[PDB]
Amino acid sequence: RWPTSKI
Amino acid sequence: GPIRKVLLLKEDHEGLGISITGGKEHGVPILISEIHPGQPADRCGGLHVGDAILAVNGVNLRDTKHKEAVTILSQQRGEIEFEVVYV
């Protein structure tokens, strides 16, 4: 439901 | 838990070594969902899955949208100070 970003 | 200040050191050829989720548009903080083994956040020692990132290098992230936080976090270089809290 929430986005995930690899940073 | 207590608010903590954590220092992270990273070269320019690497990322931070974390995955983040959440953001203001979802009604939750910027949250660390992964710490990638051997990358700078892991190596720093003080950042953990479940931590909310409250600020980075004095930039408040408490009311930031997900992609705003990505831009802000990815811009930081070198010696990077995090303010975090585990709830």
Author numbering:
A (entry chain C): 4 to 10
B (entry chain A): 284 to 370
Passage from the reporting paper:
We have previously described a peptide array-based approach that enabled us to design a selective inhibitor for the CAL PDZ (CALP) domain.
Each substituted lysine was capped with an acetyl group, to more closely mimic the electrostatic character that would be present following modification with an organic acid (here: acetic acid). As in previous analyses, co-crystals contained two protomers in the asymmetric unit. The A- and B-protomers are superimposable for all crystals, except for the complex, in which the P−1 side-chain amino group is oriented towards solvent in protomer A, but forms a hydrogen bond with CALP-Ser302 in protomer B (distance: 2.9 Å), suggesting a dynamic interaction. For example, a P−4 acetylated lysine interacts with the CALP α2 helix, whereas a P−1 or P−3 acetylated lysine faces the opposite side of the peptide binding cleft, and a P−5 acetylated lysine can access either side of the interaction pocket. For proof-of-principle studies, we chose to further diversify the position with the highest baseline affinity, i.e., P−1 in , by introducing three halogenated substituents. The modified lysine and the terminal moieties are oriented similarly in the complexes with and with the additional P−1 substituted peptides.
